[PDB]
Design a protein around this ligand. Sequence first.
Ligand SMILES: Cc1[nH+]cc(COP(=O)(O)O)c(/C=[NH+]/[C-](C[C@]2(O)C(=O)Nc3ccccc32)C(=O)O)c1[O-]
Ligand SMILES: Cc1[nH+]cc(COP(=O)(O)O)c(/C=[NH+]/[C-](C[C@]2(O)C(=O)Nc3ccccc32)C(=O)O)c1[O-]
Ligand SMILES: O=P(O)(O)OC[C@@H](O)CO
Ligand SMILES: O=P(O)(O)OC[C@@H](O)CO
Ligand code: NA
Ligand code: NA
Lengths: 396, 396, 267, 267
Amino acid sequence: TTLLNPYFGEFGGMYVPQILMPALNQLEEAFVSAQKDPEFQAQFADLLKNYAGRPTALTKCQNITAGTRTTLYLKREDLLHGGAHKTNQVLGQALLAKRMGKSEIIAETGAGQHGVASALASALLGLKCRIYMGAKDVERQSPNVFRMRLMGAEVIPVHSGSATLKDACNEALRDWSGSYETAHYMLGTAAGPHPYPTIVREFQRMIGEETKAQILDKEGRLPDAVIACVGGGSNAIGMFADFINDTSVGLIGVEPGGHGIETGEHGAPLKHGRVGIYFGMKAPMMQTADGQIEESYSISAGLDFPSVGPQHAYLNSIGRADYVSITDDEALEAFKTLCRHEGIIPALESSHALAHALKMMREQPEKEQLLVVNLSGRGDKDIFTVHDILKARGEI
Amino acid sequence: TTLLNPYFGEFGGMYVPQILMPALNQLEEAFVSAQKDPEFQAQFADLLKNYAGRPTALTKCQNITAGTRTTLYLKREDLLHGGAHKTNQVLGQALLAKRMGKSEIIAETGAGQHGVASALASALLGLKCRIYMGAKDVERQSPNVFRMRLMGAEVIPVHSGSATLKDACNEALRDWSGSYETAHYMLGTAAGPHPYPTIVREFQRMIGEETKAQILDKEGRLPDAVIACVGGGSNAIGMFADFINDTSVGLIGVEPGGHGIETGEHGAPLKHGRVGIYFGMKAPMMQTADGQIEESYSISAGLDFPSVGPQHAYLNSIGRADYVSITDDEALEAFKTLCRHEGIIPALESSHALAHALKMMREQPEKEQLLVVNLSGRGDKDIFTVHDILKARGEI
Amino acid sequence: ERYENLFAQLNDRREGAFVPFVTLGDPGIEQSLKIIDTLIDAGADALELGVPFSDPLADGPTIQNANLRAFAAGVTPAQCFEMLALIREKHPTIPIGLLMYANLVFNNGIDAFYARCEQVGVDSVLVADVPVEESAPFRQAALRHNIAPIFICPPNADDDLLRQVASYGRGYTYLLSRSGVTGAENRGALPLHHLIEKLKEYHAAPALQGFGISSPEQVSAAVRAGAAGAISGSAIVKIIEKNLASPKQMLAELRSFVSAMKAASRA
Amino acid sequence: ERYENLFAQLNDRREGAFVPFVTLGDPGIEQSLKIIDTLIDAGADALELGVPFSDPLADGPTIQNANLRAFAAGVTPAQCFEMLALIREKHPTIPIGLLMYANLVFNNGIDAFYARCEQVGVDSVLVADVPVEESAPFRQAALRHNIAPIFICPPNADDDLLRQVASYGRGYTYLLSRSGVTGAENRGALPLHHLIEKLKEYHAAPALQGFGISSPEQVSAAVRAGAAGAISGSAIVKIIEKNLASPKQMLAELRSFVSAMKAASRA
Ligand SMILES: Cc1[nH+]cc(COP(=O)(O)O)c(/C=[NH+]/[C-](C[C@]2(O)C(=O)Nc3ccccc32)C(=O)O)c1[O-]
Ligand SMILES: Cc1[nH+]cc(COP(=O)(O)O)c(/C=[NH+]/[C-](C[C@]2(O)C(=O)Nc3ccccc32)C(=O)O)c1[O-]
Ligand SMILES: O=P(O)(O)OC[C@@H](O)CO
Ligand SMILES: O=P(O)(O)OC[C@@H](O)CO
Ligand code: NA
Ligand code: NA
């Protein structure tokens, strides 16, 4: 029994050990109550505006589109406090955690962006935060690890499995299953068991709401398409949500193609996996013929997850949203192009979305189209990854 | 002969080799014309809003002031595109450079923040950018160097002198003295020869203008004091400017005390140097008894400059503004305190200003006072410096 | 059926059940079969058997490593079912319960999975990540193929949940000792008398307490509190892990442990 | 005064002036004095002398390194003035001009600096970072102490600037060969005939061309274009830098270079 529908068509649900159902039910109840509470909405809004820096700019890119009939705007979540869209929902989830009388926060992270966001919200709002991070990501992301620790968070390397995001996810949920009385699990994406896909969407939907208002003000019409990368689904559903009922607006999600779909080294379960049950949800998964969960791969540690949120799976199944993939090399080229031609260093995650937009422009350069890319974060965290790649490839 | 006054009392002027006077006169003329040009103002405003992210938030800090009668707001220039206030004036100066038909940009940088800002504006606006940086700063700031290079800037290490900011300043001016026909010198602070102190102030004064409007909206009155760090003077004069005629508002500038004023290893010429002529201006300098310019020192490479802009020297001489100093250790403690209690990682430069505010609160905790600190940038660039210090001190 | 027969016989003898858990194929197929025969010969009243899964979200490091050892030996679910058939051929009456993760049941069809369980002689299936709220297609498929669907009674169970587990479960009720994941070092100490009494009031399948049971004293406490028996997994698996290089000493230490745990179940 | 006498004598002989520059105290006080005597004995008509300064913003690497060598020998402005007095005692008629940075003139009082120049027998002072627009207190102090204030005519000079340099300067006019900083490798090739003619029309002090003059052919070109002479610094300093370990070969190479450059000034 739930207050809200846990499914998006066939996808979603609450596939957790029985011990955790009361925690999920309490969270749902607290969320429904908070959404009707003008004091909660006012405090959330105040933090978003005066602490995180909303609204974020919508930037027209008048160098990268030269010579084509594409007009391209970037929604500048990279300018949010912390450097990415993750800060939106951590603020809301932290307020929910306090509303429920929880004093501790558990969070997973890949490249460290949700970790940094969880750490900063916990520091501001007086919560004790512990972050699980794949040991391979820890080794490669020592700067974001130190940032989390500077803000008072405990960072716990995870050495199991691939030692990446999926493994951090597993450990966080194991932890919560023995600490839910005092700890809120601050899940970092629009996935996992109900109510997380719904809560994360609602605490990220200001992205699309602002984008709609900004594009109407500047262009007098809606975009032809909005484009966002998809690792778990948070930034994409935050952009998509307010446009779902605007049937003329294309919704395009970009999964990581890694080394190429044909190599098996990618993170594109929505289009190249099949439905399974894992991480609390019924959703498309990368899995073996036997039903073991496969390890994903991407140059971008924030997209390195072998499943995807159920609402995206649903929006795809009905044809409302279209999903594509972008390889490591395509993302790298988009990263370099934005740095050099717009003076913006984008996250490698967001570079996947930009790469697809650039493809939409370059493939049909005389097609008149108004596109918005969700620039979900900044790429300062990625400069070492990019450097080592360009060094190994002889480019520098 | 000039259109505008080159002096602030005794301080300022145009102490450059004769060859450069026409360049300075042309720049002054272009600036005066641009300030009256509604098309220039509209383009500048558009970039500030839709590209850089103005207005920036004014954040109330309700954990660090607990138990005292201090109310503390931070002006969030750390949320500007690029991560610091430098982006404001580079956008204006780049537009001036284009207005004058210049195709190239010369810029100096210390820790790399003005370098990053110059590189990003040049990438956006189609200018060829070369950045001088002290070799010791290059060695210690390889991330910001790579960011500049990703955005297409040429970064030139300077091995002479102390191999820090002053030395980068020297080389940039030597370069300009042989390239002014095609290159605009994008000086990074409110110092140097006229008209730079005036131009930089006017292209940074939105900081204080916004702060005034925001504080009036939130508190219904002006601040008791506004507090900003002073390395060359840009961020401080940008905050101060709109309050100068509000006589009740204290203006407090914070120079680096380094290892302690008494050690001679500091960067506090305004209060601990004496007037000299160098870097195109008559201004307080750290200098030997013989008149050789001394080398400065600070944990913060952005405050490591042995002079200061002439308007600050003037505002001090008449008692309108008060200047103090903060040591390395005091700045480090303020950095740690903001990270842990507000979830904001501040630049080590801005940490000097916060440290003085915290002192104002802690020394007189029952004094009712409304303070604004100019949080001139974010501290992501500084995490390695802080890490190595905390490692050497046994703290980690 | 096998559970009803077992619990009737144990009640006549005023005995609780001792039910060890191992991961099928850990550390290899042949040693796993010898292990299971040793557990039975040493006094196991029933078996709980895990199929190696890539991401066991309800298990602590001990059973995580059991899965890894099994995978290192190439163990697949298909091979696990071949083992299950052999075990049943040797032991016609012992109840055999599987502990599964949902994706392995769902992967190639829920109905087909339970059909295979019936083919090999499995008596019950507990899906660790399928709560009662999501169980409909699993419990229907189980019952269609004469498999008992097992449901968990957690320590935070409310009355509605008690009534659901009592109505929908068969064979036995899995009474959790504590929150958290599997682990022999984490012993649950919360008194469970109230939950045990409600389950009986609601005519639930007899309760077997599990999680953290690693000593004979814990087995006696469970039976004395009213549970029909106790399950021990990590404690058993540690004996395997400790003796990987000494397969004979492994079996001897397993026999000693099982014999002592079963002795503590006798009243 | 010494400049007027020199230029009158040179004009009678239809000669241009060759004016070397060195940094005082490079590579040491005693060798610097021997260097200067060699430059005079080899044919220098006048001297331009730099006082080491910490941040010479108008100099390229060659003269930057001269300052560093001087500082490495402990050379101070006070020691430079002691040298200047000794040089004047040996050479009563040669014009001696200083090339200064503003802070060293301003540091302890503009008036006092020019008073010391007069005491030691200096004839002129050029402050590299004080343009005409800022020169008032410097030129007043110079004239009060019978020192010629030297002003630069850059290649981008407009007519107003030409008239100012002509009115305010004395001794000689410093005609820049090119933009940029000092440097023997960067040779200015822009024709300066127009500026030379305007200066003469406005009765300016005779022009000495400087920056990039490193060969005898450049000296002849300057005089042929109408300049009263030519200044060479970096080319001289490179001979010092090259022979730091061979002080005698240094003087011999300096004599050869100076003699050849002065020969090219004769018409
Ligand atoms: C700037 C930026 N843009 C886009 C994304 C993609 O994530 P989404 O698909 O939008 O949700 C970013 C990723 N951040 C995360 C990963 C995380 O999000 C997380 O925290 N747990 C989790 C669990 C499953 C999948 C994904 C995630 C990190 O910390 O590595 C990112 O940093
Ligand atoms: C976030 C932040 N906050 C405050 C400051 C202090 O500078 P101000 O006193 O405000 O001007 C920051 C410094 N940035 C500069 C240094 C620079 O400014 C520059 O570029 N040339 C220059 C020349 C003389 C003095 C100072 C400077 C850098 O790039 O290292 C900074 O990065
Ligand atoms: O491992 P433990 O903690 O004994 O838990 C029992 C479990 O492994 C079988 O259900
Ligand atoms: O060094 P150069 O280029 O010869 O310039 C002359 C200068 O050093 C003296 O005025
Ligand atoms: Na994914
Ligand atoms: Na300074």
